[PDB]
Each structure stands twice: as structure tokens, then as C-alpha cells.
From a paper:
This structure showed a bidomain enzyme with an N-terminal amidoligase (ALase) domain, also commonly known as the synthetase domain (residues 1–278), connected through an interdomain linker (residues 279–Pro298) to a C-terminal glutamine amidotransferase (GATase) domain (residues 299–552), both domains displaying a Rossmann-like fold.
The enzyme, in complex with either UTP, at 2.0-Å resolution, or UTP plus the non-hydrolyzable ATP analog AMP-PCP and the glutamine analog 5-oxo-L-norleucine (3.5 Å), is a homotetramer with crystallographic 222 symmetry, consistent with previous studies reporting positive cooperativity for ATP and UTP due to nucleotide-driven tetramerization. Also, consistent with the oligomeric assembly as a dimer of dimers being triggered by ATP/UTP, the nucleotide-binding pockets were delimited by residues from two (ATP) or three (UTP) different subunits.
Residue numbers in the entry:
A (entry chain A), B (entry chain A), C (entry chain A): 5 to 429, 443 to 552
Write the structure that this text describes.
């Protein structure tokens, strides 16, 4: 029989930006490779109910789950390292917790009580942590739930989360709950020494709020010597086997090997009394060979509205690299500001030396003339094109304009357009997984190797069906639709006209994993390798 | 010219229930008696947006301000000690702050930002503290704003409030901001010693979150000796003149004298560089003579739905005592459960030895047959009656039933009544101050000594005007109405039928002060003294 | 009239090794250059009563003051940056404080009291801090006492010192006491960001023990941007003018310019209400030109017993560089292990490419055959030699052996020597300043430009006077003695035999300053420049 679901909390000390999320994901990968059913959850101390109101060009992309929740980009790291679909419950924010509790209070659901941080707010957080241990849709209960606590220990914002995690430990006991604390071991260049004092003080602050760490992640720019690990084991009263030297890794994919060398995952398995099995390194060693030993390089333009923050297109960038890994190729991303591609000379200067053009999503942006300009250039140049959501819409708009509908546009970007080739169906916001049926022998069906697929959506604008016959005059095919045929889901040009020009209303990058590249990104990068070889 | 408005923060350490609110109010009284314009504010760390969802029979009454806000009962203590009307802004809750910030976030008012505890929550609290320093309706800016911080220092719930108060100090400087910290000095009976260690540790916790106390309130069951005050001055680094021995007082009205003997108010005035003037003791010494030296006693029944928690009727109980003070009388409150007054024998057992019957408000209660039974008994017995809100409604229902409308009731308590003598005008919830016009020479006009008054309301049910002629058959007079005459505001019987049976739709107790008794409570207690003398 | 002596406490947070001592010294230099009388003191939390029991080859040199106290090497940094003689009271250790208090307790001096950390230990520390504000021998009372608190805030070992400093502030008031806190602002290379969180948490720990910092030293590997300084000013509630970006400097002599650019010294002067005067940069700008713009280079061997820790010979190394500065020369120190110089081929390999040989002191070492070997090589080679304490003794031993006393030695290193040319006078340990009278026209009198000098000693072995005539057969002159002529203080060879071979029983390096090079080191480096030019 399966033992109780274990809870492993990941907290951070000293300072943020130490990479707690990627350490947690890498531990999730190691435990998954040991045959454990691992799920992950992020507690975000921000008040935004969902990250949809945040500027993604400052704060990073919005990740969308199968069930349609808009979440912190960390859920994307979890899905990529676990190769698993996570529920919307995998991202809890202070905003969610407080508005749920306040809304219940206003309805009289606390029956005359004074509604308090303890127990009402901490009960809500605890409820959301414990919900992760419920059996999934297939009927499976996880072995381990890894919960990452955002914010830094000693700060005000994470106090209700840390209190809830302390109560989870109190109610489930030490056998079912593990605390992993991430700290910084700074190097002082004038004296040449590494310092353990910040970890010593951070662990005392963690202990002061009632939490005893079982293990410590020592984030450092170099190996932490055994003498320093011994000092930390003694001063922080942590088993020496739980004191983990975690030096900065060359790639994010190398972090599981760093943690495994320090035997963190074997310590976790023994401490939580989990079924023991050796790590099966087959899948991850294969990824690492594709990461560190590519056989060729290919340049891809990512034509984003704003490209100074790569995290705004993190899942797209990861899906492009994963497409490369499948071909044993290194994808070099050429970050191109879409505003520079509006004119033919601007698009030529920006895209003249690339091998493929990716037009990503642009939820909430204004001004798409640069994205349309990039597609017009790529079509004339013979460059492969992959359009995602706004990308498909731009492929459809450019096709309509190429056949005489000069002022064709989306009613989203030009409400006064005489030809709204993209329009609402107010309409309906489509979030999360939606099924699509593909034309057999189409470019998209050949890429997927099936005619029945599902992809995640985040949009309310659709191809206007009144324009299908007029748009098709360009040779553009509506090669994928909703099962009833009403909604256009995929577009493509015939391969005799353009070897690879594909659009999707969805975000296939979200279902990409470094160990499981998405079929559309594999076909796109493959077409980019073909273009390079032809040139 | 008037100097900058000063902010005086009152925090609590060691444990709650030490009486921070009454200490703050008493300091507000002392500063007011020095001719300073003082306003007060309570920061409540509970999530209830307003205390309307709290059971008042567990948590205490809801106070209503002139502008119609439903607030914590502490605002009532502030109004009573300051003799001033406070704005709805005088009560800030965590619930208010978080729902305001989350609602702004959902509307996109933070323009793409990550919404955080610091600065977004603390900016909202700071905004609400600084709003208290704005000029009032008459154009006057306060000299001092006393802000009471609910919760205890070292607890999670008060951390955003304490951080906001620390930022107020940072931005206004030490000259305009004063920190008063309330602590416990426990007595250990086996060793016979008072202990300063809890104050020492509480002040270190206060300092740890960035606040330096200017003065300390040492709450104790006896005088704190000079040697202990010297130890605290040294260990807490507080001026000895700011170390205040605050032993438990015999009455709440004695606390200003306790603080004045220790010269706390003179220390505050000097430390904040406020205009100096001696306390004018005329008004408070007069109150203390009425408190400690009554010339007679009078027994009043307070016929409440639930009477085990006196704080559920705090403003009523204070208004009854203030009515007594005006007559140099001691009002002994006989707390009577209304459910025991439904039958004539039950009402006789409960009210047979009282001199007056007060029927208070009952916002949100169910089952008023006991309150109607108490009025029927009091009318037959010749007992004075004062009804407040639900009290007037019960006087009107009992009058209607005494003239043949056997099933007369409020549609609130019996929706199926064939005679809804009390009904909505859904209707309109009337909150805060409303003007009333009184019949000249009526009992109510003679009590007020004017025909034009205003009182605070908290109700949506009104006297049904279709029943005025039928109800008047009992001899009941509609002696007070809204200015247009549409809404019944006051009822009374003629003095030749009952010497004092008065109802009001409002809560006059809220406008009562111990130094300014409300005219209706003065007339009611006076009628109770008359009944006692006649018996 | 002179205002009250000010106390400026320097504490450290986050981690040790940030350079608190050199920051404090540099501030002492800036205040001295403003015409203020500044004195400095180090509080060391170690239990060693004096650093004499510490291995200097692990922990650094022992500094000796004029009054003969053996102190932490930090006193040497203070003397060098202030150009002032400090009393033995300038170094307080936990060992000193506890043994003084325990010794008084054992004698019954606390008259029946329970002897406690507070107040008995903290009174002793406070006494030692306040003693620094007493008028000196010349009758002058300092303007400022800078007290450096060793250990890190949040650690156990510095708690009594920090408590004493908090009591100094309590008793003298905020006008006479200033707190400077040194913190670390680490850089995280993967994200490219500087982090203020460790300073935020360190200042909260400092505040928690009752201390409010007036200013912060932000130790960093680069400039701290204004946005981070603004964040720290707000979160730590420190005046923005007191938030000091202190990036790692190229030389220790550049730190005053770093602090002056951030206007720390002008902030200190204004905050403590000290007489204001601009920094006179004449002397320090002159030093910086000699530091950064040398006209030539000269190589000097420092023939130490153990040379892997340069701090074991810090004052010697600084005196050598200061000798270089006087000649506008860069002294390159060739760290030579003395054990490798015992044989003529070993000494040739080690000293063949140098321009001068310095034989430093060796209090407590064993095995001096390598130092004697280095002197024998340097004499034959024509290399300049400067011997300090053990160095003079080695010059005397080598001279005695060169004239037939083959087994000549010190009774310290060979008790069985038939010729103890160096011996005790048990004897008398000579510590601190001793006067010497110099032979007019001798090498040493020409270097000093006077025949009457004083130097600091740390030794009990002396030249055995029974051997003066025999040693003089080598041509060695006893060119300096005690005033009564009994003790040999200086030795030298005639310039016609060796241009510069000088020994001193004292430690002249201790009286060296970078702005005031010692005459013997100036003459030694000058002789090394002469040797280089001749080669
Ligand atoms: O264990 C780790 C984690 C992270 N990293 C390195 O740090 C980089 C940043 O890692 P993250 O993307 O996880 O940083 P973050 O700002 O989200 O950190 P938190 O506040 O969540 O703690 C990564 O891209 C990688 O280069 C490591 O080398 N090792
Ligand atoms: O909680 C503690 C830990 C240590 N100490 C004291 O710290 C002193 C050593 O001071 P360090 O700064 O060298 O600390 P560390 O070695 O523990 O840490 P890192 O260098 O790795 O940053 C020792 O003299 C010990 O008494 C405390 O006083 N309290
Ligand atoms: O300074 C004071 C305050 C209070 N008291 C006595 O304490 C009683 C309770 O005083 P409170 O009604 O103010 O208690 P509380 O529970 O609201 O306390 P906080 O959490 O707000 O701190 C009062 O009725 C009076 O008897 C004093 O004697 N002196
Ligand atoms: O660490 C904590 C514990 C509790 N609380 C908050 O304390 C509030 C209750 O405040 P109390 O003063 O009543 O505390 P208590 O019941 O825990 O202790 P005693 O009366 O027995 O002295 C609750 O509203 C809860 O949110 C914190 O904010 N932080
Ligand atoms: O303000 C400063 C102080 C120091 N330093 C640089 O740091 C080096 C080490 O400076 P220290 O010799 O003062 O380090 P430390 O180990 O004694 O530190 P504490 O525990 O006393 O705090 C110095 O030689 C210089 O290179 C700076 O650049 N700036
Ligand atoms: O005491 C505090 C300070 C700040 N915060 C919270 O810290 C969050 C920002 O988290 P950071 O890690 O970015 O902190 P910082 O900007 O203050 O410091 P550095 O990056 O310079 O190291 C904000 O969301 C704020 O609510 C606390 O909760 N408590
Ligand atoms: Mg992260
Ligand atoms: Mg150390
Ligand atoms: Mg209270
Ligand atoms: Mg005691
Ligand atoms: Mg130092
Ligand atoms: Mg930050």
C-alpha cells in the first residue's frame, strides 16, 4: 500500500533571486526519476489574485494550465521538470487567499466570528496546500507535494504562508513533512573567503517562527568546502547529509546532477520514509547530451512586442530549445522587437540572417503592424513561420491583406476595420485545454502524427468565419478546427507555396518539456534547419 | 500659527486585554482638557470589512458614526472621552485595506505592478492614518491624531499596521510622531514581586520591527515602585518621565487622573513640542463627583435579547449611567433576558422590582415577543419605558395589538403578518445622522428643549404610515418625524396616560457622553427616579 | 570652549571580514584632517587577556603601544591612520573584562553582591570605553572616541559589548553618541543584481538589541545605486545622507577618499554637532601620489620564520612601504622563509635577486639558523640589512661567529651555548618605549638626524656586555645604548665595510606611519635603492 502523501516545503533565506524554484523543480525531477509521483505548488506572497494584471514585460510570462488557470511562470518550470500537467491549485497567491476569506466573511459564512489571520487566513492557505494531496482525475494520489514558499524568511509578506506550513507539520507530524531551506554563502573577494554567518542567522529566523529545517541548500558561486558544511551542520543543527553545496550551474538542466552528487534526493527519500529506488538517469542524460553536445546551430527570430525581458517569452524560448534538442541542434534565439519589422527594410535588417521566424502570443498588447510586417517578409524570403495565438491572427490578417482586403485587421487592434477578419464570437474568453480536429495529410497533422489534439488557450478573439473563402484565396488552409468545425484552431500554407508557415490559436509551448519537445516546435526547428542548409 | 498635526501611536505588548483603548481615550481626554484638538483612530487587525458580520453578543456592540459607518466599539470610547464626532475613517480594518487594494489591483489601477504588502498594503494603511490629519467639515485640522494599533507586538496580524506607523515616523520625523507602548508588569504572589522582564522583552520586539517607544504604560494591579521604573528606563532606554505606572483604576473615568498623576500628558506635550496649557479639570472633576458620590440609586431593566456580554449594550449602559450622573444618581442596571418577559408572569418576575424599562436595539436578532411582553407589563405597571430602534418598533407593535390588531408585527420578524405595522419603505438602510422635527410641547420636545434634532440610525424597517390612524387609537402619538413628515422618528404616550413611554427609531446612546448626557436618557432616568419616589 | 567628548561606535552586520577596522581608521583619518582630536579603541570579543598567547602566524602580529601593552594589530591601523600614539586602554578584550571582574569578586570588592553580566560586566566595559575620553598626558581631552565593536551583531560573543555601547548612548544622550553599522551588499552574478535584504535584516537585529544606527557602511564589490540606497534609507530608517556606498578600494589608503566622496565625515560632524572645518587634503593627497605614482621599484626580502600570513609582519610591511613612499619608490616585498636561508646555496637562491634584507622580530619562535644564514649571505653579497629585535641579536650572533666564537648564540635558542653573546640581564621583559642615546656621526644617528631617540620594545634578552670587545673585532659598532650605557640598543657596521647593516633591539616599524615614514626604514630603503643602481 501507498504511504501517506508527504509534504516538502521549500523556503528561502538571506535574499531572493537565489533560484529556489529551479532547485525545487530539480528536486522534483530527481524524485520523479526515482519512480515517485511528485506534484508541485507555488505560494506567491503578492496580492494580484492572478498574474494577469502584471505587466509580463516587467514580471515575466503568465503560464496557463490544462484547467485554464492563469498562474505564475514557476508552474511552467514545475511542469517542464516533472513532465506532468499541474492543476490551477498549484499557484496560491495572497490575493486569492484574502479575497476568498473576505468574500466568505461578507456572506456571513464565518457565522458571527471575528475573522482573523490565525486561524482563518492560515486555514485557507493550509486547505490549498492539503488540496494538492487529493487523488487526481486518473485516481492517483501523489507520493510527494513540493510546496515552494515565495518571499524570504524574516519578511512580513510570507509570515501567513510560513505559519500555515508550520501548522501542516504540527498536524501531519515530522514523518510526513520535510523543510528545505535555501540560503546564500557569499564569497568576499578581498579576503578570499566564503561566509556561513548569513545561513546561521537565516536558520535562527526560520527556527524563531517555529520551523526546523531538515536540509539546507547552500547557494554559492563555487563548491562549499566540507569544513564550512561541518560548521553549518553544527550551528544550524542540520544532519551533515542534509547540508547541500549548490554552486551556480552552467545550465538549468545541470541542477539535478548538482543535487544528486550531494545526495539530497537520497537524504529526502530516507528522511520521509518513502519507497527507495535508484534514479533512472536514461531520460535526463539524453537531454544533457542534447544540451551540451549539439551537432549544429540554427538561428530563430522571436518577434516579440518587447524583448528586453526574456522571461516574458520563457515557455516559448524553452519550446524552441526543446525543438532544437530533438534534432541535436542548438537554437540561437535572435530577440527581435516587432516595432522594427513594420517596414520591409526594417524587417529585412532584423530578419535577414535568421533561419526561422516565431511570432509569439501578445495577450493585452497594442500595435501589431510589426508582427504582420515580419510575416510578410518571411513569406517573401521563404523563411519558416510559426505563429502562436496573436501569431495565427497575424498570419490570417496578412493573408487577407495580400488578397485585396487592404484594411483587414482584428477588431481587437482596429475596432473601426471594415474587414474584421479576427473578431469575438464581448465573446468568450477561451482558457486552458480545447480539443482540435486536424485535416489528414495537412502540415499540422503530419507534425503531430495524429488528427486529434488538444492545446491550451488564452484568448477571446477568433477567426471570423464570414471571411474563410476570401482568406483561402491566398492559399491559406484552415487545417485545424474545433470538433464541431465552428472555430479555426490551426492555419497553414500548402508546402508547395511555403515549406512551413503555420499558425495556432493556442499556446503549444506550454505543453512542451525539455524531455518531450512539442511536435509543432520540432517541425518548425526542422524547417529552420532545412532553410539554413538550402542557403 | 498651528504647528504640524502630530501622530501618537498606541501599541500593546506582552498580552491583549490590558486596556490600551481606554488608556488612549484617557490620554485623548487629558490633551483635550489642555485645549488641544484631538482626534482618534483604531486599527483593527481583523478581516471583517466592518464589524456588522460579527455576533455582537460575543464580540460587543457595533458603534455608528454621524457619517453612517459601522465601526468597532472603541470609536464609542473615543467619542465619549473626547466629546467629539469621529469620521468613519476612525476605524480601519485589515479587511478594508486588503479588499480596497485587491479591488484596485483587479481594475488595473496598479498599472502592471506586482501588488505587494510593502509598499501597496502599507501605503493604504498610511493613507488612512494621514487622512485623519485633514481639515474637518468646520475647516479645523487636529493638533494630535491618536492611532491605536490593535493586536499585540510580536504577532503576525499587526505587522502591516506597525510597518505603516514606522513609515509615518520615517516620513514625518521624530518631532511630529510619538510612540506609546502598553505593557504588563505581573505580580508573582508566592515571591511577592513585580516583574519588569516582560516589558524588557516586549520593547526589544517593538524595537526589532523599527519602532522606538517614547513612553511606556506599565499596566499593573498595584503601583510600580520607582526602582522598577528606573530599571525599565535603563533597559528599555526610555526617559524616566515617560515610564508610566498605570495601576488598575476603580472606574474607567479614573484613568485620566492616574495618567495625569504620572504626568504622561505633560511629557507628551513637551516631547511633541505642542502648545502648552494646564489641564482644565472643571468638567472631569464634576463627572468624578457624580461617579463616586451619587445622592441616590435607581434600578433600570435593560431588556436585551442576550445579556451575558455587557459590551453588546455598552453605549446604552454608558448613556443610562450618564443620565444618572445628570441627576446625581447611581443607575443600577438589571440585565434582563427578553425571552423571559414573553408571558405576564415572566415579565412580572423579571421587572417587578425595577424603576424603568429600557428596550434596546436588536439589529439582526430573531424573536421579539419578550420585548413586546416587557412593554405590555411596563405600561400596565406604570413603569417608564425608553425604546431604541427595535424598542420603538416594539412600542408600535404592542400599541397596535392593544387596539385589536392581534397579529400586528414587523414584516422583519413575521413576514406573513396580516398587519405589517412595521415594514420597509427591500427598502432603504438608514445609517448615520438623520434630521427629525418634533411636535412642540410633546414629551420628546420637552426632553430635548428643541423641536429640531438629529440622531444616528442603523435600520431599514419603518413605521407603516397606512397604520398611523389605527395605532393612534391606543393614544400613541407620532411626536417626531422626518422633516417632510413621511418617516416616523419618535413615538410617545400622552403624560396623562403614561408619565414616560417613549420610542425613537434612532440610537441616541451613541451621542451620549459621560460629561454630556443625552436629553432622552436624562428624561428617562428622571422618570425612573419619579417612579421610585412614588412607590 | 570644547564640547563634550563624542563617542562613535562601529558595529558590523551580516558577516565578518568586511573591513570594519579600516573603515573606522579611514573615518578617523578624515576627522583628524578636519582638525579634530580623534582617538580609537578596539573591543575584541576573544578571551585571550592579551594576544600574546595567539600564534601570530595564524592570527596576525601583536602591536605594542608606547606604554607597553600588547594589543590586537588593529591598534596599529589606528595609529597609522591617526598619526597618534594610543594608550594600552585602546584594546579591550572579553578576557580582560571577565578576569578583572572575577578577580574583584574573589577579593570581596562587590561587597556581598551577586556579580552579574548586567551591570558588573557591562559597567567594566563602559568604564574602559569612557576612560578613552579622559585628558591625555599632554592634558588634551579628545573631540571623538571611535570604538570598534569586534564580532558580528546577532552573535553571542559581542552581546556584553553592544549592551555597554547601548548604555553609553543612554547615559550620554543622542547628541554625544553616534552608531555606524557596517553591512554587506552582495552581488548575485546569475541575475546580475545587488541585494539590500541582508542589510535590512542586520539593522533589525541591531535595533532589537536597542541600538539605532545613525549611518550605514554598505560594503560592496561595486557602487551601490541610488535606488538601493533609497530602499535602505526607508527600510532601515536611516537618513539618506548616512547611507554610504563603500565599494572595495584598490589600496587601503584610498578608503578615506571613498568615504569622503559619500560625505560620511561631513554627516558625522553635523550629526554630533562637532566644530566644522573642511578636510585639509595636503598630507593624504601627497601619500596617494607616492602610493599610485612611484618613480621606481625596489625589491626587499622579509626573512620571516613563517611567511604565508602577511599580517604576522603587517607593521614591518607597512614601514617598508612607507620607507619607499619617502623615496617615491615602490617597495616589492619578497616574502622569504628563514628556514631556507640556513645554507649558503639556500640563502643565495632566496636572496640573490633582492636589493635589501630585512630580518624581523621573532618573539616566541624556535630556530634562527636561517636568519643568521641570511645575514652572513647579505654581508658577503654587499646587501643592505635592517634587523629588528631578533634581527639585531642575529647580527650580533653572526658577528661573534665570524671572529672565531663558532658556537656563539643567544641563551634563548641554545641554553647550552659556551658563548651566550645574547642573554638575560630570568631577566627583565622590556615592553613599550625606552630611551636610547646614539653615537654622533654613526649610521643610526645620521638616519634619525638626532642622538636622542625612543623606541618600543618587546623582549627580555639583551647583548651580553662581557662579549662587547670580542664582537667589536668584527668591526661591529655598539652605536646606540640605554642612557646609562648598560644596554645595547643599536648596532651597525662602519659604512667603509658595509654601506648599511643596522640592528635595533626595538620595533621601529610600530612608530612608522604612511604619512611619517620611520627614519631607519627611510635609510634602509634608500640603501636598497643605492644597491639596485650599483648593480
Ligand atoms: O540551484 C540553482 C538554482 C538556480 N541557479 C541559477 O540561478 C539562475 C536564477 O534562478 P531562478 O530563475 O530560479 O531565480 P529567481 O529569481 O526566481 O529566484 P527565487 O527568488 O525564486 O529564489 C538560474 O537561471 C541559474 O543560472 C543555479 O545555478 N542553481
Ligand atoms: O551564534 C554564534 C556563533 C558564533 N559566535 C562567535 O563567532 C566567532 C567567529 O566569527 P566569524 O565571523 O568568523 O563566524 P563564523 O566562523 O561562525 O562564520 P563565517 O566566518 O563562516 O561567516 C567566534 O569567536 C564565536 O564565538 C558567536 O558569538 N555566536
Ligand atoms: O489604563 C487602564 C485601562 C484599563 N483598565 C481596566 O481594564 C479594563 C479593561 O479595559 P479595556 O476594555 O480597554 O480592555 P481590552 O480588552 O479592550 O484591552 P485591549 O486589548 O484593547 O488592550 C477596564 O474596564 C478597567 O477596569 C484600567 O484600570 N486602566
Ligand atoms: O503568532 C501569532 C498568533 C496569533 N495571532 C493573532 O492573535 C489574535 C488573537 O489575539 P490574542 O491576544 O487573544 O492572542 P491569543 O488568544 O493567541 O493569546 P491569549 O489571549 O491566550 O494571550 C488572532 O486574531 C490571531 O490572528 C497573530 O497574529 N500571530
Ligand atoms: O572600507 C573598506 C574596508 C576594507 N576594504 C578591503 O577589505 C580588505 C580587508 O579589510 P580588513 O583587514 O579591515 O578586514 P577584516 O578581516 O579585519 O574585517 P573585519 O572583520 O574587521 O570587518 C582590505 O585590505 C581592503 O582591500 C575596502 O576595500 N574598503
Ligand atoms: O520587511 C519587509 C520588507 C519587504 N517585504 C517584501 O519584500 C518583497 C520584495 O522582495 P525582495 O527580495 O526583492 O526584497 P527587497 O527588494 O526589499 O530587497 P533586495 O531585493 O534589495 O534584496 C516585497 O514584495 C515586500 O512586500 C516584506 O514582506 N517585509
Ligand atoms: Mg523564482
Ligand atoms: Mg568564521
Ligand atoms: Mg480594547
Ligand atoms: Mg530582577
Ligand atoms: Mg578587522
Ligand atoms: Mg528586491
Amino acid at each position: 500500500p501507498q504511504t501517506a502523501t508527504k509534504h516538502l516545503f521549500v523556503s528561502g533565506g538571506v535574499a531572493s533571486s537565489l533560484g529556489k524554484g529551479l532547485t525545487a523543480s530539480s528536486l522534483g525531477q530527481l524524485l520523479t526519476a526515482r519512480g515517485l509521483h511528485v506534484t508541485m505548488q507555488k505560494l506567491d506572497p503578492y496580492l494580484n489574485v492572478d498574474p494577469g494584471t502584471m505587466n509580463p514585460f516587467q514580471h515575466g510570462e503568465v503560464f496557463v494550465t490544462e484547467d485554464g488557470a492563469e498562474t505564475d511562470l514557476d508552474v511552467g518550470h514545475y511542469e517542464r521538470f516533472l513532465d506532468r500537467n499541474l492543476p490551477g491549485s498549484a499557484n496560491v497567491t495572497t490575493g486569492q487567499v484574502y479575497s476568498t476569506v473576505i468574500a466568505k466573511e461578507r456572506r456571513g459564512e464565518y457565522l458571527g466570528d471575528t475573522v482573523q489571520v490565525i486561524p482563518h487566513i492560515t486555514d485557507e492557505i493550509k486547505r490549498r496546500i492539503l488540496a494538492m494531496a487529493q487523488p487526481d482525475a486518473d485516481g492517483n494520489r501523489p507520493d510527494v507535494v513540493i510546496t515552494e514558499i515565495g518571499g524570504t524568511v524574516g519578511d512580513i509578506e510570507s509570515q501567513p504562508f510560513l505559519e500555515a506550513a508550520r501548522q501542516v507539520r504540527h498536524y501531519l507530524g515530522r514523518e510526513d513533512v520535510f523543510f528545505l531551506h535555501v540560503s546564500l554563502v557569499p564569497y568576499l573577494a578581498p579576503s578570499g573567503e566564503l561566509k556561513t554567518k548569513p545561513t546561521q542567522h537565516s536558520v535562527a529566523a526560520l527556527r524563531s517562527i517555529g520551523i526546523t529545517p531538515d536540509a539546507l541548500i547552500l547557494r554559492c558561486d563555487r563548491d562549499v568546502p566540507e569544513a564550512l558544511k561541518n560548521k553549518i551542520a553544527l550551528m544550524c543543527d542540520v544532519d551533515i547529509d542534509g547540508v547541500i553545496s549548490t554552486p551556480d550551474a552552467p545550465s538549468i538542466y545541470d541542477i539535478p546532477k548538482v543535487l544528486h552528487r550531494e545526495e539530497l534526493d537520497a537524504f529526502v527519500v530516507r528522511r520521509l520514509n518513502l519507497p527507495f529506488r535508484d534514479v533512472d538517469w536514461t531520460e535526463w542524460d539524453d537531454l544533457l547530451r542534447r544540451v551540451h553536445e549539439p551537432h549544429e546551430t540554427v538561428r530563430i527570430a522571436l518577434v516579440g512586442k518587447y524583448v528586453e525581458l526574456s522571461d516574458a517569452y520563457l515557455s516559448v524560448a524553452e519550446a524552441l530549445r526543446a525543438g532544437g534538442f530533438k534534432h541535436r541542434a542548438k537554437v540561437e534565439i535572435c530577440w527581435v522587437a516587432s516595432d522594427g519589422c513594420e517596414t520591409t527594410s526594417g524587417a529585412a535588417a532584423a530578419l535577414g540572417d535568421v533561419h526561422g521566424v516565431l511570432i509569439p502570443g501578445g495577450f493585452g498588447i497594442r500595435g501589431i503592424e510589426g508582427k504582420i510586417g515580419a510575416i510578410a517578409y518571411a513569406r517573401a524570403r521563404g523563411l519558416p513561420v510559426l505563429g502562436l495565438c496573436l501569431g495565427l491572427q497575424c498570419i490570417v490578417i496578412e493573408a487577407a491583406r495580400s488578397v485585396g482586403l487592404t484594411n483587414a485587421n482584428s477588431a481587437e487592434f482596429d475596432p473601426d476595420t471594415p474587414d474584421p477578419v479576427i473578431a469575438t464570437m464581448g465573446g468568450t474568453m477561451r482558457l486552458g485545454s480545447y480539443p482540435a480536429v486536424l485535416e489528414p495529410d495537412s502540415v499540422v497533422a503530419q507534425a503531430y502524427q495524429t488528427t486529434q489534439v488538444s492545446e491550451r488557450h488564452r484568448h477571446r478573439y477568433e477567426v471570423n468565419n464570414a471571411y474563410r473563402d476570401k482568406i483561402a484565396e491566398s492559399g491559406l488552409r484552415f487545417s485545424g478546427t474545433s470538433p464541431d468545425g465552428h472555430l479555426v484552431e490551426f492555419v497553414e500554407y500548402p508546402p508547395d507555396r511555403h515549406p512551413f508557415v503555420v499558425g495556432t490559436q493556442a499556446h503549444p509551448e506550454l505543453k512542451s518539456r525539455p524531455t518531450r519537445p512539442h511536435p509543432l516546435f520540432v517541425a518548425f526547428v526542422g524547417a529552420a534547419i532545412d532553410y539554413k542548409a538550402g542557403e
